[PDB]
Structure 1
Amino acid sequence: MKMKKGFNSQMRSEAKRLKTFETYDTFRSWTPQEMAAAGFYHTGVRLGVQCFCCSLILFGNSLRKLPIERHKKLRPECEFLQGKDVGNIGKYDIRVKRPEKMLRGGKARYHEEEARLESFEDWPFYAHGTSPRVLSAAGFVFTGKRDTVQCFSCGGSLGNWEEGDDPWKEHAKWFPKCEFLQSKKSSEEIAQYIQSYEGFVHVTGEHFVKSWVRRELPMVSAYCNDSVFANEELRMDMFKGVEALVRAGFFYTGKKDIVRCFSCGGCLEKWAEGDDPMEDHIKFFPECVFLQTLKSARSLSEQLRDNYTKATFRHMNLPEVCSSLGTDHLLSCDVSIISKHISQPVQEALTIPEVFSNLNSVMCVEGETGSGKTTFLKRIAFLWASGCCPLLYRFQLVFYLSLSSITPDQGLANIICAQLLGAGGCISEVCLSSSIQQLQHQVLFLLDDYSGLASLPQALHTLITKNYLSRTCLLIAVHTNRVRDIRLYLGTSLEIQEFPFYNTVSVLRKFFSHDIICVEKLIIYFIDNKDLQGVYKTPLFVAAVCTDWIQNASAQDKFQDVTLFQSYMQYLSLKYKATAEPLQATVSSCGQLALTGLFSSCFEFNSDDLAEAGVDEDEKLTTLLMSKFTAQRLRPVYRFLGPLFQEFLAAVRLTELLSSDRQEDQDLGLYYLRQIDSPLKAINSFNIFLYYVSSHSSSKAAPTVVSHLLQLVDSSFVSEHLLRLALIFAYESNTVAECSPFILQFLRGKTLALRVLNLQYFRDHPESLLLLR
């Protein structure tokens, strides 16, 4: 209840307000990214988080209100930029201003040291944990603005000082060529000081991506609030007075009349009189968004190709996640990563804002098939091009290349010009080779859809196999347990663990205005908790539930589980329509396995049974959309997405078998239909197998199974007859109530007790209710 409130926790900014959520459960509405962007950190008292400037006991976490709204509503006296040690992604150096420019009179006097001591009257209260004496002992002087300090005789500015950061390691790390440093400290201790988290970085205040950013006030919900990025957004199509004024909280994505604020908008036609705050952001944009954002040689060639890469990464083509229909630029939810280390099995979970700082050499990212590799690579490329995340400023060039058979060993220049630039980039082989060589650790390749060394081109092969004479940094997307070739070559392997539920609920929240469907999904989901995992193993379930809104709400209020599963399966069928032949096999071949276990009462499904089922024979991609490597001690197990998914896949296999006219691919279906042989078997199996063999409009399969249900005959006795006939009539009326019933149910099952025991659909009653009922 009561914990040490104290005061401003000066040791707590973002990128440290996010790392505190590794001890946070993955099932709740608000996200660590959004909560941390609100200046909150996870103490761990029971479940709650508190702010770093205005300590708040915020435990309850609702859905209709974002953390910014709660923080403003409860204690509104800490967000007037009165002073907060807010660090953004914050590459720790971006302050490069005045390398030799106008200081406040050169308070170091260009010689003196006690002058550096005395220049710190207005040293703010953000730091202070850092002693001004130790800062001044290394030739540092306070330039005057926002706790950034400049060192003379080399003119280097460092900011975002935190607790315990000794300004002697850092002065060595960021400027080895600082004359004062070589004058005082020997060339031996500096190598020891090099040991830090950034790989090979140097003085990189000059770089073609830079864009100075403000104090990153917490009213910045997420990216796209820098008022300079949003301006160059709409230099493409909204160019043929209105434009510059539209940047009162807007940016362009789409077809010249769909311009989006941080929530949504554009539902009005432009070029009329039309003041941009029209209808005050059209009806406040429901919930009065952010108080109107709070009241408003060949170096030339490589720079030119840098500009083209930035332009083609900011084009509307790349930033499109949740690629179903809509108008999307607002998603920033990240994927959790835990990086296994080369030698021993240590997990060591990372965070997205900190993983960028460790990019050193050839890197691989794991991940289940359809789990967010292409998205993550596109996000990092975009964030480089959308230059406001500072950590990515160290790369002068980034390249996204999908090695999906477009590369039969032809050449790197040809593959980079025809995939990224487009009709404009004539970057020659020699130009690209020289750019790679001189820009050693400032070129980041993002390779996707990996196959193997044999398929890479010559230059890419050299860059991936040596990484000694080139120093280029690469990130390759691969499949889990399918990266067995570059084990010896890579450092800092990475893996996409899972997709937590807060990301799913955040994406659901953003896409919807009628936010009663999402809450219904929340309640109707934590009551099962058996399919808690698996279903959210991939972001494709979010896309499936979103595209289920092509007809109505995703909470149709009628046995939600079967609709959810069918929506998922239909979305799988839709996405891979280009290569649907193996998927149709993967759903069938794997699906039959579930049927084999539907009645044998086993869900572990060890490896040797998979061969009998007839799936994974080629270790193919899609077979991981429906199973996971649950255990890896020995003889890895293969568990599906919960017993309910057992049921649904077994049902779809049974329907396909009893629907196919292949005679002896159907006798097996009848055999699997045979084991149900008693009313208790018509209950215990059909408690969970009821709406799954019936849901599908199995025209051919309906008569055989309804006949089998009828032929079982050869209070509790009467009761089971009543339930059995209820099942049979419901099943037969689900799809077609003409062919099978008029010749089948007229035989045996007709019973009722008082008035409404046979209140089903009304047709011609029997002669006299089976002559005995």
Structure 2
Amino acid sequence: IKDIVQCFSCGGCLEKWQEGDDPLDDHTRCFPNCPFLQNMKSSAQWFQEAKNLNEQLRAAYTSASFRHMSLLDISSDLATDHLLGCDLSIASKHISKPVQEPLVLPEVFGNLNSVMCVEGEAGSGKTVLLKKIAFLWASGCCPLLNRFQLVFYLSLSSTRPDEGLASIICDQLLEKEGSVTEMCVRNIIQQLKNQVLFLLDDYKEICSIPQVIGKLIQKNHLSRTCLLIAVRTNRARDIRRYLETILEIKAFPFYNTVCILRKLFSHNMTRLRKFMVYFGKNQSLQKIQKTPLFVAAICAHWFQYPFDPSFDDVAVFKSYMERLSLRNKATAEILKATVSSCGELALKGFFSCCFEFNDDDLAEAGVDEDEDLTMCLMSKFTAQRLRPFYRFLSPAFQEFLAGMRLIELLDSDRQEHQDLGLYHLKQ
């Protein structure tokens, strides 16, 4: 950012960089408590082509356009570099036997081999995770990943199933349609093999993929290129056949929520303090902040009323479904329709104490399980089971949706869809 000089050990500061000053005295004067300062006071044709590609990739990943990964949608400014200290809860599940074990990142990076997959609910943070890995590699200050010579972060969001690798990396990773050719890239991949890693985001189906990439999944024994694919649990039926184990993202821990809020704010301690107490007594409501996207919903609200010393426990839900309209919107007939149909499902479920639905219960509600919006509210589970099921994001959210639907029924002027509100109210 223009002239913002940040300290790794305390956050963004020194705005407008006072001219002619001394950074050691300015740092000390502004933050006379920083541990860093306290310590200070106390104290071969393909080969050459591959090298040129490597340098370009590193430059792309460490650039201030790949860093500051739009975390929590704070801004294009207001550096968020100090917010990249929170990780996700990862577990490894077997596709065959009912076995699950917890992991930490140092034990994941050391087990990257052939084809691996990261599964989770919408907004779980799987896209940030893949970018973080590419960033660590490019930096070079993370031994264990330094064995890879080429790392490609690509998004299979609209790429046609006929595009070659050169035509993809030159579009998403490199500045211009140059540096590499299709033959150059293929020659490199078959020489490095184990030292090449692809990070493939936004995966949908095996059919709608570049042929050149699909061949690295289906027959990955003649190449041994390492692939890491991130998918939603609403899919993840297409690639299980090629896996041994799956990395699953678990609920985002409450203590990470606290840290993020503490770092971004702290200017209003009387609000943060109330937050801590509220979720201390209401032990089950800690499950509301299951997905990082809900944390973003809080931050977005807390930045609008920075000096209002009160915690509104439903603000996160009102915010969450407001920001939902700014992702991929279609207010008419889509956003309203998906919320309404999902709301009906939730409303019925909350008077039978279900909190779990099958396909027939879903179908009668008029919910389209293949819609994109009905994945930011609800998740599908197709794990090793005779029959699949659906569940809403953290149950407190279901009650919120049920509440919303009840109001719509009571306010509507259609008798056929209005007396129903009284039917439910009288329960």
TM interval, shorter chain, is 0.7 to 0.9
In the alignment, does 2:279 pair up with 1:530?
no
CA distance in 2, matches of 1:581, 1:336: 36
1:458-483 CA distance string (max 9 Å, x none): 21121111111111100001111522
* Residue 483 to residue 675, structure 1, CA distance change in 2 (3 Å): closer
Among residues 247, 251, 256, which one is paired with 1:503 in the alignment?
256
Answer whether contact 2:266 2:272 (CA < 8 A) is retained: no
Change (3 A) 1:657 1:675: closer
Q: Are 2:152 and 1:365 equivalent residues in the alignment?
A: no
The CA deviation string for residues 120-162 of structure 1, in whole angstroms up to 9 with x for no partner, is xxxxxxxxxxxxxxxxxxxxxxxxxxxxxxxxxxxxxxxxxxx
Does 2:189 correspond to 1:436? yes
- Match of residue 61, structure 2, among 313, 318, 333: 313
| Higher-strand-fraction structure | 2
1:521 aligns with 2:267: no
The answer to whether residue 159 in structure 2 is matched with residue 406 in structure 1 is yes
For the pair shown, the structure with the greater C-alpha radius of gyration is 1
Name the Cα RMSD after superposition: 2.8
The one-letter amino acid of 1:606's match is: F
Distance 2:125 2:46 in 1: 37
Cα deviation, residue 584, structure 1: 3.6
Instruction: Give the equivalent residue in structure 2 for 1:134.
Output: none
Q: Which runs of 5+ in 2 are unaligned?
A: none
Query: Would the alpha carbon gap of residues 519 and 463 (structure 1) be closer, same or farther in structure 2, given more than 3 Å must change?
Result: same
Match of 1:669 in 2: 418
- In the alignment, the residues of structure 2 paired with residue 462 and residue 592 of structure 1 have an alpha-carbon distance, to the nearest angstrom, of 44
State yes or no: 1:379 paired with 2:127. no
Q: Distance in 2 between matches of 1:343 and 1:639?
A: 23
Residue matched to 1:270: 17
Aligned twin of 1:739: none
Contact 1:396 1:443 in 2 (8 A): yes
Contact 2:355/2:395 (CA < 8 Å) preserved in 1? no
The code of the aligned residue for 1:400 comes to: Y
Distance 1:631 1:454 in 2: 20
What residue in structure 2 maps to residue 345 of structure 1? 98
Match of 2:153, SS?
strand
Change (3 A) 1:337 1:465: same
**Match among 62, 79, 100 for residue 327 of structure 1:** 79
| Displacement after TM superposition at 1:323 (Å) | 2.7
> Quick one: higher RCO (CA 8 Å, sep 6+), 1 or 2?
2
Aligned residue among 288, 294, 319 for 2:34: 288
TM-score (norm 2): 0.88
Following the alignment from structure 1 to structure 2, what is the Cα–Cα distance between the partners of residues 612 and 538? Answer: 28
How far does residue 566 in structure 1 lie from its aligned partner after superposition? 1.4
CA distance in structure 2 between the partners assigned to 1:625 and 1:555 by the alignment: 29
- Other-structure match for 1:650: 402
Q: Does 1:417 align with 2:165?
A: no
% identical equivalent positions: 51
Kindly provide the CA deviation profile for residues 161-213 of structure 1, in whole angstroms up to 9, marking residues without a partner as x.
Answer: xxxxxxxxxxxxxxxxxxxxxxxxxxxxxxxxxxxxxxxxxxxxxxxxxxxxx
Distance 2:397 2:205 in 1: 34
CA apart distance, 1:375: 0.5
> Which deviations, in whole Å up to 9, do the C-alpha atoms of 1:283-338 show, x marking residues without a partner?
216x4343355348231211111001000011111221223323211112111111
Contact 1:531 1:642 in 2 (8 A): no
Aligned residue number for residue 3 of structure 2: 256
Q: Alpha carbons of 1:317 and 1:474: their partners in 2 closer, same or farther (altered >3 Å)?
A: same
What is the match of residue 353 of structure 2? 602
Q: 1:265 to 1:327 in 2, by over 3 A?
A: closer
SS in 2 for 1:596: helix
**Change in 2 beyond 3 A, CA 1:361/1:630:** closer
How far apart in 2 are the matches of 1:541 and 1:385? 30
Other structure's SS at 2:145 match: helix
Q: Per the alignment, do residues 409 and 585 of structure 1 end up closer, same or farther by CA in structure 2, a change over 3 Å counting?
A: farther
* Contact 1:335 1:496 survives alignment (8 Å): yes
CA deviation map 1:70-99 (0-9, x unaligned): xxxxxxxxxxxxxxxxxxxxxxxxxxxxxx
Distance in structure 2 (CA, Å) of the matches to 1:532 and 1:580: 34
Cα 1:293/1:431, change in 2 over 3 Å: farther
Q: Counterparts of 1:396 and 1:476 in 2: how far apart (Å)?
A: 19
1:613 equivalenced with 2:365 (yes/no): yes
Q: Out of 301, 313, 318, which is 2:49 matched to?
A: 301
Superposed CA deviations along residues 705-742 of structure 1, whole A, max 9, x for unmatched, are xxxxxxxxxxxxxxxxxxxxxxxxxxxxxxxxxxxxxx
Q: Deviation at 1:281?
A: 3.8
More displaced stretch, 447-456 vs 265-274: 265-274
Q: Relative to structure 1, is the Cα distance of residues 304 and 655 closer, same or farther in structure 2, using a 3 angstrom cutoff? A: same
Residue matched to 2:314: 562
Matches within 5 A, 1:373-772: 373-423=126-176, 425-480=178-233, 482-514=235-267, 515-533=269-287, 535-553=288-306, 556-557=309-310, 560-577=312-329, 582-598=334-350, 600-607=351-358, 608-615=360-367, 617-627=368-378, 638-640=390-392, 644-658=396-410, 664=414, 667-674=416-423, 676=425
The amino acid that maps onto 1:389 is: C
- Matched-pair contact (CA < 8 Å) for 1:365–1:495: yes
SS in 1 for 2:117: strand
What amino acid maps onto 1:523 in structure 2? Answer: V
Output the CA distance in 2 between the equivalents of 1:554 and 1:403: 42
